[PDB]
Design a protein around this ligand. Structure first.
Ligand SMILES: [Zn+2]
Ligand SMILES: [Zn+2]
Ligand SMILES: [Zn+2]
Ligand SMILES: [Zn+2]
Lengths: 130, 78, 332, 89, 66, 46, 66, 206, 183
RNA sequence: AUCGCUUCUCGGCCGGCUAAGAUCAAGUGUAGUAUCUGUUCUUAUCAGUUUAAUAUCUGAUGUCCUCUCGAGGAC
């Protein structure tokens, strides 16, 4: 109810709540409902207000560690290359936040991307089968 | 035909059970069900604009089967 | 639902082995590394039956492992290269039959990374300064000195950072009571990224560079560089000073090359092949690993191919000038 | 005007004054002190011995990180001794 | 606390003098014609007491009467 | 410090207050406004 | 961020992003003893020669840029 | 004997029932995550266990409301009920009863040469107790490299509903003040604790 | 060309108006259709800054979860003259709530959304989850049919609706339980 | 029975006097955001910058000759 926006401060503060909740609950197996809440968190990504954007950043960082990167990245894929400049600015900011931490665990989750003329974009190592 | 006139309704009906009601047949794009201000109550007749005309002519055919509060509902072209 | 996990058979796979004196005894305890596991064995001089004195799980991915000693010291610690951003110095208390955590230092982020150290690990023969390195961009150094009580104290880190530089291997270098040297295999891909043609894919040789730690100036400066003719996978310390010349061996495709500074010219020898081999001639050869045999009398080296062929590597020197190299077939 | 120096993290312990005493540096919070602060002697030296990481007064205690910044692993970056964008003194 | 009394008193005064002004699900005051949001009802009322708010009601007046 | 420029909000609220309370009670009307006194409210009315 | 390798931005090209994830995959392979051993099993080589071929493929992968 | 479980190399599990009369192959469900799959095993009709080329173990259970006959990229899915990182790649998964007179359990080898098992809890008591074990143990007895346990087992995927036995057993190797003081924080005794962890091992395995 | 670009994709529907202007469409075509990934929110190209108060003024203030409702705190919370407030300081009375610590040790233990495939956007509330074949209770009451809704008897004769062509409604081509008589 | 007037009855809209009794609470600054009000583009076409596309910004009004913007001739 709060994250659904009456006025920006609702989204902000509620988002902070999602953050501290997200750090606190880590590892105990409640992730599902946190995913549900992440749905309603997700539209707030876009705004120029400093406090709400930095709030949302903290939010999605805590949600990163709690949910695990895979789900995050699955929300952050399409936004990377989108035509608009705005969307790319932001989704690349997010994707960086997801990228610095847990860069080791991201490997599995990069999807299959077909190879073009000059370049081979398939990593065949993962397709070696005994 | 995109719009229809709907008579003979009970004010507990509102714009919502018309929304829901006629989209059961096919979607009402624009709903109009007057709210009378003076005594704050509905006379019960309606006007409906659809996506195009085919929706509304099928609507002429099927449409007058609705019964609002045990009672009959008029639907004709407009 | 909930699952409780149990191990029954612990992994027999051994990734690393380091031999040092961890009890302060004339015997040599062998610290070996199973995949996630740290392990300590005691072979017997007579019967040779290998006693397992300790088996411990570190709950973290071991990356590299090295043992060292303080100068002229009685005992040997352990350096654990790990997947976390922390190097840890360990000591095995013989009595307590378990390791203690002597030092915990945090140099960066967690998990196997591209830029985060712990990957490659080297240390000075005198144990002055240990050098830790990642695969790319970050090479750090911790200096070690025993305290007033002769108990080990670790210094503050340093930084070797060199942009866009891949590190094949890092090996400690022997300079007795000197400003320490380190042999870093490097390569630069910055030539390759800006070359749309693909020429820099070829015609780019991996640069061998010797860094020099300097205690007085207390930083790490790039000093020595030579381009390597062909790409070798790893390097070997050549004990210098009193015993032998100070230099490094370089194990390269179908060759081994003693390659050193001063005036010392490089010495190359081909990797001998067996008579009448059934393998594809197109498949070359290098060496897998090497274990130096160091004696108060003499010293030599042990090398192995893919095929399992261990050779005894020797040095023919004139004073401190090595004129040539002799490799005799040893065993398989 | 005020930002981290981010020189390499050494073994020197952090020092906070009266004012900053309870604060975890990055999260600005007092909650769950757990781990310990490390900054380089390049940031902490001399007149900075036992100096506050922030205001420039004598350190009466040592800063402890929160658990929040712990799991997000921020405590492992460059030395979090704030430098004003003039000199540090 | 004296500040709390003023908030109460300036809502009631803007209730007396008050059909368009309302309060959303949050606490703010809104003009349902103009879709403006007002910090205080009296501050909002003045916009409600303004000549622009006046017009947009007449324009919607005509726009409905057609 | 209290003195300053008159605002549409303060001025309309002054209209309503004068309507409700009456002309002779100034201290009551100055009580509702901020940054304005009773004298200023009266002279601002007349 | 900039001095942290792998940092992206709005102008990031395909080629750079995929060569990044390549090189990071390879550092993971160098990192995990097992997965490396899996590779050695599947395509028959030494652990060494595997790591060597990878270190050759570090700069190249996908080949020349565009 | 009823349904068929497809394991993708990349996108993991695809639930496929074969309709016998129409002879059609029917995909009625799939995974919510991509996972590189080594091999699969059936804990039951509604659950699947799987291992990652990266050395992860996941268990995904169908909802009891699944539609058994049907006709972004899917319709209905299955929640992921367990994620645990072994740190060692697992090439086979087999459920069985290790010892006669023992309780049914789950079995996993690995590529490292290790053989280990997963075991269900029959009570919430041992559950919560082992929970406190893991908790006070972690901070009071950190892993050796300085690496954190929790992250290491949460490595690729966050831990869901797994207690790590190899950490709980280290209660033996701690100093008597650690052993005791922690047992007080547990309100037990070293013999109580120790035997109570010997319980699961004994009953299920050697 | 936005035309021929639609021949290179398994699900070319993903390509949109501004998609043809992308700096790398030859990829984004392949990403946007990735298996489990979710679409970008739609509030951009709408200049409205993500929300307005039209539909948001008809919402309830809040409603509690049933687990918190059965407790009984709701009736306890509900007024005071100023001198009664300074009397409330001088008099003061204690224990107005007087909650049962057994009850609030009970509810959240003894007694006590969406999947990943969904994401919220601005105006969406009820609609997608009243459809042909799905109606509300009360309007059933006005209709007065005991547990097809009877004008799907005439959806037999006159034919399937032009407006919702994909339609199936029970008993005709759709071979139904509770309310929902068509999908 | 109707008109007018009247009486009764019913229904619907439907806070005393005094000296006016006396008296009358405002912290600051650094950053930053939101919400009100007021005012401006019927510009035609093309070129460039720019934008996801718009938007925006930036430049000029078929050519030549003759006569007094208009007319004629050659294109
Ligand atoms: Zn510094
Ligand atoms: Zn301070
Ligand atoms: Zn903090
Ligand atoms: Zn208005």
């Amino acid at each position: 109810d709060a994250l659904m926006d009456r006025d920006l401060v609702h989204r902000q503060t509620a988002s902070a709540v999602v953050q501290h909740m997200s750090l606190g609950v880590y590892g105990f197996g409640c992730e599902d409902s946190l995913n549900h809440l992440l749905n309603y968190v997700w539209p707030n990504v876009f705004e120029t207000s400093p406090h709400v954007i930095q709030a949302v950043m903290g939010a999605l960082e805590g949600l990163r560690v709690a949910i695990g990167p895979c789900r995050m990245l699955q929300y952050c894929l399409q936004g990377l290359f989108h035509p608009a400049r705005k969307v790319r600015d932001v989704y690349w900011k997010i994707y960086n936040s997801i990228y610095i931490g847990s860069q080791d665990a991201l490997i599995a989750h990069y999807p299959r991307i077909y190879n073009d003329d000059k370049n081979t974009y398939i990593r065949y190592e993962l397709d070696y089968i005994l | 035909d995109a719009t229809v006139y709907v008579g003979g309704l009970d004010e507990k009906v509102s714009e919502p059970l018309l929304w829901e009601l006629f989209l059961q047949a096919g979607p009402v794009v624009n709903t109009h069900m007057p709210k009378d201000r003076v005594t704050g109550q509905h006379q019960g007749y309606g006007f409906v604009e659809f996506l195009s005309e085919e929706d509304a002519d099928y609507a002429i055919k099927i449409m007058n089967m609705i019964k609002l509060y045990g009672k009959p509902i008029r639907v004709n072209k407009a | 639902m909930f699952l409780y996990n149990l191990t029954l058979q612990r992994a027999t796979g051994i990734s690393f082995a380091i031999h040092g004196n961890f009890s302060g005894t004339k015997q040599q305890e062998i610290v070996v590394s199973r995949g996630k596991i740290l392990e300590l064995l005691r072979p017997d001089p007579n019967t040779g039956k290998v006693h397992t004195l300790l088996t411990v799980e570190v709950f973290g991915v071991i990356r590299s492992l090295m043992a060292f000693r303080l100068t002229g010291g009685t005992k040997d610690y352990i350096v654990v290269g790990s997947d976390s951003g922390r190097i840890v110095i360990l000591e095995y208390q013989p009595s307590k039959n378990m390791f203690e955590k002597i030092h915990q230092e945090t140099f960066g982020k967690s998990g196997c990374r591209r830029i985060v150290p712990g990957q490659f690990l080297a240390v000075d023969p005198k144990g002055r300064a240990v050098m830790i390195s990642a695969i790319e961009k970050q090479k750090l150094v911790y200096i070690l000195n025993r305290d007033a009580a002769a108990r080990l104290t670790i210094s503050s880190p340093l930084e070797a950072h060199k942009a866009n530089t891949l590190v094949y291997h890092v090996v400690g270098v022997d300079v007795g009571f000197e400003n320490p040297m380190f042999a870093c295999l490097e390569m630069d891909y910055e030539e390759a990224d800006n070359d749309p043609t693909g020429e820099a894919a070829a015609n780019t040789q991996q640069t061998l560079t010797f860094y020099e730690l300097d205690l007085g100036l207390n930083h790490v400066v790039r000093k020595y560089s030579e381009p390597l003719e062909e790409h070798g996978n790893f390097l070997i310390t050549v004990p210098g000073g009193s015993d032998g010349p100070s230099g490094v061996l370089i194990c390269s495709e179908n060759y081994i090359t003693y390659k050193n500074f001063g005036d010392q010219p490089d010495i190359r020898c081909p990797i001998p092949r067996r008579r009448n081999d059934l393998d594809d001639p197109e498949r070359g050869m290098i060496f897998v690993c090497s274990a130096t045999h160091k004696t108060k009398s003499m010293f030599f080296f042990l090398a192995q191919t893919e095929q399992g062929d261990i050779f005894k590597i020797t040095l023919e020197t004139d004073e401190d000038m090595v004129t040539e190299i002799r490799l005799k077939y040893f065993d398989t | 005007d005020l930002i981290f120096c981010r020189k390499q993290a050494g073994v020197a312990i952090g020092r906070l004054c009266e004012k900053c005493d309870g604060k975890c540096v990055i999260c600005d919070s007092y909650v769950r002190p757990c781990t310990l602060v490390r900054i380089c002697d390049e940031c902490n030296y001399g007149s900075y011995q036992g100096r506050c990481v922030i205001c420039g007064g004598p350190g009466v205690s040592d800063a402890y990180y929160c658990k929040e910044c712990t799991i997000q692993e921020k405590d492992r970056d460059g030395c979090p001794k704030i430098v004003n964008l003039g000199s540090s003194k | 606390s004296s500040s709390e009394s003023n908030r109460d008193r300036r809502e009631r005064l803007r209730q007396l003098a008050l059909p368009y002004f309302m309060k959303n699900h949050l606490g703010s005051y809104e003009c349902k014609l103009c879709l403006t949001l007002h910090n205080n009802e009296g501050s909002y009322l003045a916009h409600t007491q303004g000549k622009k708010h006046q017009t947009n009601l007449a324009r919607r007046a005509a726009k409905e009467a057609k | 410090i209290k003195g300053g420029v008159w605002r549409n909000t303060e001025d309309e609220i002054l209209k309503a207050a004068v309507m409700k309370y009456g002309k002779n009670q100034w201290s009551r009307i100055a009580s509702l406004l901020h940054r304005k006194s009773a004298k200023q409210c009266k002279a601002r009315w007349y | 961020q900039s001095k942290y390798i792998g940092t992206g931005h709005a102008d990031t090209t395909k080629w750079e992003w995929l060569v990044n994830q390549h090189r990071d995959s390879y550092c993971s392979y160098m990192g995990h003893f097992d997965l490396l051993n899996y590779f050695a099993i599947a395509e028959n080589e030494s652990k060494a020669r595997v790591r060597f071929n990878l270190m050759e493929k570090m700069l190249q992968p996908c080949g020349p840029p565009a | 004997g009823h349904r068929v479980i497809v394991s993708d190399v990349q996108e993991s599990f695809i639930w496929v029932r074969y309709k016998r009369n129409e002879n059609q192959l029917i995909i009625f469900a799939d995974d919510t995550y991509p996972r590189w799959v080594t091999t699969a095993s059936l804990l039951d009709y509604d659950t699947v266990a799987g291992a990652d080329k990266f050395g992860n173990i996941c268990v995904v259970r169908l909802p009891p409301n699944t539609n058994d006959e049907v006709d972004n990229g899917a319709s209905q899915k299955a929640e992921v009920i367990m994620n645990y990182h072994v740190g060692e790649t697992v090439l086979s998964l087999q459920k069985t009863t290790l010892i006669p007179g023992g309780s049914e359990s789950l079995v996993y080898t690995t590529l490292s040469g290790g053989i280990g098992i997963l075991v269900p809890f029959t009570s919430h008591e041992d559950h919560d107790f082992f929970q406190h074990v893991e908790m006070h143990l972690r901070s009071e007895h950190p892993p050796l490299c300085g690496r954190d346990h929790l992250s290491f087992r949460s490595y690729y995927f966050p831990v869901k509903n797994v207690i790590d036995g190899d950490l709980c057993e280290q209660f033996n190797s701690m100093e008597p003040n650690k052993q005791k003081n922690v047992s007080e924080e547990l309100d037990r005794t070293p013999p109580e604790v120790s035997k109570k962890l010997e319980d699961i091992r004994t009953r299920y395995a050697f | 060309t936005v035309a021929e670009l639609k021949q290179l994709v398994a699900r070319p529907d993903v390509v949109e108006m501004h998609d043809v202007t992308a700096q790398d469409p030859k990829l984004l075509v392949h990403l946007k259709a990735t298996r489990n990934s979710v679409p970008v929110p739609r509030h951009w190209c709408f200049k409205r800054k993500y929300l307005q108060g039209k539909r948001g003024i008809e919402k309830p203030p809040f409603e509690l979860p049933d687990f918190i409702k059965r407790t009984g705190i709701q009736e306890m919370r509900e007024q005071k003259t100023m001198k009664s407030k300074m009397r409330e300081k001088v008099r003061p009375k204690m224990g107005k709530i007087d909650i049962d610590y057994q009850k609030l040790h009970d509810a959240f233990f003894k007694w006590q959304l969406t999947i990943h495939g969904d994401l919220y956007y601005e105006g969406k509330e009820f609609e997608t989850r009243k459809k042909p074949g799905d109606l509300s209770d009360e309007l059933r009451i006005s209709l007065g049919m005991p547990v097809p809704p009877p004008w799907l008897i005439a959806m037999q004769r006159y034919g399937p609706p032009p407006s919702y062509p994909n339609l199936k409604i029970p008993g005709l081509n759709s071979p139904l339980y509770g309310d929902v008589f068509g999908t």
